[PDB]
Design a protein around this ligand. Structure first.
Ligand SMILES: [Mg+2]
Ligand SMILES: [Mg+2]
Ligand SMILES: [Mg+2]
Ligand SMILES: [Mg+2]
Ligand SMILES: [Mg+2]
Ligand SMILES: [Mg+2]
Ligand SMILES: [Mg+2]
Ligand SMILES: [Mg+2]
Ligand SMILES: [Mg+2]
Ligand SMILES: [Mg+2]
Ligand SMILES: [Mg+2]
Ligand SMILES: [Mg+2]
Ligand SMILES: [Mg+2]
Ligand SMILES: [Mg+2]
Ligand SMILES: [Mg+2]
Ligand SMILES: [Mg+2]
Ligand SMILES: [Mg+2]
Ligand SMILES: [Mg+2]
Ligand SMILES: [Mg+2]
Ligand SMILES: [Mg+2]
Ligand SMILES: [Mg+2]
Ligand SMILES: [Mg+2]
Ligand SMILES: [Mg+2]
Ligand SMILES: [Mg+2]
Ligand SMILES: [Mg+2]
Ligand SMILES: [Mg+2]
Ligand SMILES: [Mg+2]
Ligand SMILES: [Mg+2]
Ligand SMILES: [Mg+2]
Ligand SMILES: [Mg+2]
Ligand SMILES: [Mg+2]
Ligand SMILES: [Mg+2]
Ligand SMILES: [Mg+2]
Ligand SMILES: [Mg+2]
Ligand SMILES: [Mg+2]
Ligand SMILES: [Mg+2]
Ligand SMILES: [Mg+2]
Ligand SMILES: [Mg+2]
Ligand SMILES: [Mg+2]
Ligand SMILES: [Mg+2]
Ligand SMILES: [Mg+2]
Ligand SMILES: [Mg+2]
Ligand SMILES: [Mg+2]
Ligand SMILES: [Mg+2]
Ligand SMILES: [Mg+2]
Ligand SMILES: [Mg+2]
Ligand SMILES: [Mg+2]
Ligand SMILES: [Mg+2]
Ligand SMILES: [Mg+2]
Ligand SMILES: [Mg+2]
Ligand SMILES: [Mg+2]
Ligand SMILES: [Mg+2]
Ligand SMILES: [Mg+2]
Ligand SMILES: [Mg+2]
Ligand SMILES: [Mg+2]
Ligand SMILES: [Mg+2]
Ligand SMILES: [Mg+2]
Ligand SMILES: [Mg+2]
Ligand SMILES: [Mg+2]
Ligand SMILES: [Mg+2]
Ligand SMILES: [Mg+2]
Ligand SMILES: [Mg+2]
Ligand SMILES: [Mg+2]
Ligand SMILES: [Mg+2]
Ligand SMILES: [Mg+2]
Ligand SMILES: [Mg+2]
Ligand SMILES: [Mg+2]
Ligand SMILES: [Mg+2]
Ligand SMILES: [Mg+2]
Ligand SMILES: [Mg+2]
Ligand SMILES: [Mg+2]
Ligand SMILES: [Mg+2]
Ligand SMILES: [Mg+2]
Ligand SMILES: [Mg+2]
Ligand SMILES: [Mg+2]
Ligand SMILES: [Mg+2]
Ligand SMILES: [Mg+2]
Lengths: 204, 137, 159
RNA sequence: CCGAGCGCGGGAACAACCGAGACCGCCAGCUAAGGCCCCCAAGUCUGGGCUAAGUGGUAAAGGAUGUGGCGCCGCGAAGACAGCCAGGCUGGUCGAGUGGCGCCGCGCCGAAAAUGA
RNA sequence: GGGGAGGUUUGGCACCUCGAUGUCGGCUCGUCGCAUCCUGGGGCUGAAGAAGGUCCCAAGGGUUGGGCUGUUCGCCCAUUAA
RNA sequence: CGGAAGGGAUAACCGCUGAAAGCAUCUAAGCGGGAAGCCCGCCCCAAGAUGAGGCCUCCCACGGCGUCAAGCCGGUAAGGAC
């Protein structure tokens, strides 16, 4: 179960063999293993990968010991990757061969308190014949004396976006080890700068 | 004036479960769960013995029950009526089947829940080897 | 029950013979007597369900015998043109009107034989096994009720 | 009977169903209907049958080798029912019952509705 | 000719509500039932094949756009797996 | 880019062995096959799961009243807030 952290760097299109292809560019810098957790020590298998370098002063925390426990330059972030015990001490873009399809998790863009039309792509109301009061409203929300309440999970306006979103089966295109770059099939959650993880898909 | 009890040390107990009919067992477990067996009984205070059970999966049950018996878990959401047959319970967490039987026979109040804590259940056996363990049948 | 080696146990009976040994789950409330070189069995009473349990084991044991004795096997005819079957080591692949050649796995204890493209015997040590496997094949292409095709046991034609 | 006893007990809850007609007090006793496995007071009480449907936990015409119990009619050790051999009921083989009707007890089907059981 | 289920129709009764429980359509938002329109599974066929008939199992999801009318409904155009 | 694949258990239904009832029967003991449905698998939330879970790492005695016991006042550590 391959895995690797990275940051969305941007996206433009390249030309495959003779057709254009929109691709996103991720950057999965060398991720140092920080702790392998076995079923013995914990209860599952996984690996803690660090990421960006850090001012040793900013990491005055007890994290200093956690870093020392594995003897690694203080990273900025670190997340686990389930069922995946590698080799060596660092994973790289080398893990991914062009053609392999990956799942990319990320944090969608933050839209804050968004309207129902915005959030659930509702219909709203008529712009003309009707009252100029419900142009973008949800309209009805229930029945009468029965049930006489509102179903839990009713779609309504509210804080939306800015959450964990995973897009799947993105085919890995040309991957440049020379610079730790990694091209993908374009659509990938988050803003240009967001930490994203890249895993192995489930086609079979 | 009737006797006014005072602080009493928790009497633990070890109970088997092999071959024991689900309910017939749960009854006694419940009755021992509250201090309702000891003659120094007081509903107010709640001082039932810490019952600990083992070999849950072993529990017997008469007739079409593994297949018939259905358990209801209602979530707040629509159609969340999710229902599970007895066989599935023993597959997943089997300890549940005895718990959801004892829990049902304990009183409804706040101390009734405080009693459900006194009840410990596993299938192995091998309880957390504490101290007390007075076996029983 | 000649030449056999039936050995009684609590809730089961281990029968041995030339073909081998095979377990046979025996009812609880039944007496598996081993009179002489042969075997008997008797029921605790004379109730409706007990009668059923007697006759069931009465035969079910006799199968454990014959099973390790002469063994079991069922034939399989194959009608229709392209319809045929080539044995391939243990397993047998048979094209029978499908774009994909049917590869049939050989379960343990069973070893079907192919004397001819049309005929196919199924060697086995267990009536339960043999019976299923036989059907498992007829299942691959039941007898077309509008003419002769697909596999047949050895019974009448569907016409 | 409620009304006027929405005062008490039971019946899950509930004017009029079952018990009962509340002058006040009691950390006394016998009961009533209804109950005595746990929530819930008192029998996991005794003895004799029935029921494998959770029936019980509450639906009909009508249907069925469900299960148990009772009575009658036809064949049968002069070999019957069933299967296997032969001929088109008869023979042989085996060898102890077999086939049809009626009644009673409990039970199966018939049995699909909307927020969670 | 006979037994029933449902509580969508028309209705019977007058039980809460007349010191107020806003009525038909539409829109918006749905959600539930299954007695299933489609898709999945299956039995019988007067089932050759393809197509179809009737019955059984099964809500997961799906279930178009327009002309006419205030319409619900219905008719009609063009399509659909429906 | 998604609906899956896949594993498991089932519905109607198909079947193996098989008495009760010498035969016969999918069933009464037993076993196999079988759905867009059920369980799981994917994706999101999630230890107020008060039944408050696990791991890794950092800081660590008392300085004064209550005679056991539960506490109170201040300077601090790791670390946190403004
Ligand atoms: Mg960190
Ligand atoms: Mg994770
Ligand atoms: Mg609009
Ligand atoms: Mg207006
Ligand atoms: Mg206005
Ligand atoms: Mg309500
Ligand atoms: Mg930018
Ligand atoms: Mg044991
Ligand atoms: Mg529902
Ligand atoms: Mg639904
Ligand atoms: Mg313990
Ligand atoms: Mg001990
Ligand atoms: Mg046959
Ligand atoms: Mg009067
Ligand atoms: Mg009066
Ligand atoms: Mg009252
Ligand atoms: Mg009353
Ligand atoms: Mg009254
Ligand atoms: Mg009264
Ligand atoms: Mg009376
Ligand atoms: Mg009077
Ligand atoms: Mg008396
Ligand atoms: Mg009683
Ligand atoms: Mg008794
Ligand atoms: Mg009825
Ligand atoms: Mg009747
Ligand atoms: Mg009929
Ligand atoms: Mg009929
Ligand atoms: Mg009986
Ligand atoms: Mg009868
Ligand atoms: Mg004769
Ligand atoms: Mg039914
Ligand atoms: Mg009628
Ligand atoms: Mg109505
Ligand atoms: Mg209504
Ligand atoms: Mg009406
Ligand atoms: Mg009147
Ligand atoms: Mg009014
Ligand atoms: Mg008012
Ligand atoms: Mg008002
Ligand atoms: Mg009106
Ligand atoms: Mg219209
Ligand atoms: Mg249906
Ligand atoms: Mg119909
Ligand atoms: Mg299709
Ligand atoms: Mg057919
Ligand atoms: Mg058909
Ligand atoms: Mg057809
Ligand atoms: Mg056809
Ligand atoms: Mg629908
Ligand atoms: Mg849904
Ligand atoms: Mg239309
Ligand atoms: Mg119009
Ligand atoms: Mg108009
Ligand atoms: Mg009209
Ligand atoms: Mg017209
Ligand atoms: Mg027209
Ligand atoms: Mg037309
Ligand atoms: Mg057309
Ligand atoms: Mg079938
Ligand atoms: Mg068929
Ligand atoms: Mg036979
Ligand atoms: Mg048969
Ligand atoms: Mg069975
Ligand atoms: Mg049957
Ligand atoms: Mg199966
Ligand atoms: Mg299966
Ligand atoms: Mg399926
Ligand atoms: Mg599921
Ligand atoms: Mg968490
Ligand atoms: Mg916590
Ligand atoms: Mg914690
Ligand atoms: Mg220090
Ligand atoms: Mg110090
Ligand atoms: Mg010091
Ligand atoms: Mg000192
Ligand atoms: Mg400080």
């Amino acid at each position: 179960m391959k895995g690797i952290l990275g940051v969305k760097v941007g996206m433009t299109r390249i030309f495959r063999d003779d057709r254009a292809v929109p691709v996103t560019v991720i950057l999965a810098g060398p991720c140092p293993v920080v702790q392998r957790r076995t079923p013995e020590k914990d209860g599952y298998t996984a690996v803690q990968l660090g990421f960006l370098p850090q001012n040793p002063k900013r990491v005055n925390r007890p994290l200093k010991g956690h870093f020392a426990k594995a003897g690694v330059e203080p990273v900025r972030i670190l997340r686990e990757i389930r069922d995946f015990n590698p080799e060596g001490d660092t994973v790289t873009v080398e893990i991914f061969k062009p053609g392999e399809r990956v799942d990319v998790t990320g944090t969608s863009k933050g839209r804050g308190f968004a309207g129902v039309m915005k959030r659930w792509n509702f219909a709203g109301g008529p712009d003309s014949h009707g009252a100029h009061k419900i142009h973008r409203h949800p309209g009805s929300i229930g029945n009468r004396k029965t049930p006489g309440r509102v179903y839990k999970g009713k779609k309504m306006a509210g804080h939306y976006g800015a959450e964990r979103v995973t897009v799947m089966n993105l085919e890995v295109v040309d991957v440049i080890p020379e610079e730790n770059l990694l091209l993908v099939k374009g659509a990938v959650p988050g803003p240009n700068g967001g930490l994203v993880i890249v895993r192995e898909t489930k086609k079979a | 004036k009737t006797y006014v009890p005072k602080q009493v040390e928790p009497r633990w107990v070890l109970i088997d479960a092999e071959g024991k009919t689900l309910g017939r067992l749960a009854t006694k477990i419940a009755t021992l769960l509250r201090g309702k067996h000891r003659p120094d009984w007081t509903p107010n205070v709640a001082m039932g013995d810490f019952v600990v059970v083992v070999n849950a999966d072993k529990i017997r049950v008469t007739g079409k029950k593994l297949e018939q018996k259905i358990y209801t878990r209602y979530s707040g959401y629509p159609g969340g009526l999710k229902k599970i047959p007895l066989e599935k319970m023993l597959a997943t967490h089997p300890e549940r089947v005895l718990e959801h039987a004892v829990k049902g026979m304990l009183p409804k109040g706040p101390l009734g829940r405080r009693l459900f804590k006194r009840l410990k259940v596993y299938a192995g056996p091998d309880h957390p080897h504490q101290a007390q363990r007075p076996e029983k049948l | 029950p000649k030449g056999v080696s039936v050995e009684v146990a609590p809730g089961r009976v281990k029968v041995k013979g030339p073909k081998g040994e095979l377990e046979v789950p025996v009812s609880p409330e039944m007496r598996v007597v081993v009179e002489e070189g042969v075997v008997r069995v008797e029921r605790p009473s004379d109730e409706r369900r007990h009668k059923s349990l007697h006759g069931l084991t009465r035969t079910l044991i006799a199968n454990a015998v014959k099973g390790v004795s002469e063994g079991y096997s069922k034939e399989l005819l194959i009608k229709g043109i392209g319809y045929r079957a080539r044995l391939v080591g243990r397993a047998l692949e048979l094209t029978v009107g499908f774009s994909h050649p049917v590869v049939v796995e050989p379960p343990e204890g069973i070893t079907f034989e192919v004397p001819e493209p049309t005929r196919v015997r199924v060697s086995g040590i267990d009536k339960q096994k043999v019976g299923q496997v036989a059907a498992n094949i007829r299942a691959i292409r039941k007898p077309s009720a509008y003419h002769e095709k697909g596999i047949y046991y050895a019974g009448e034609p569907v016409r």
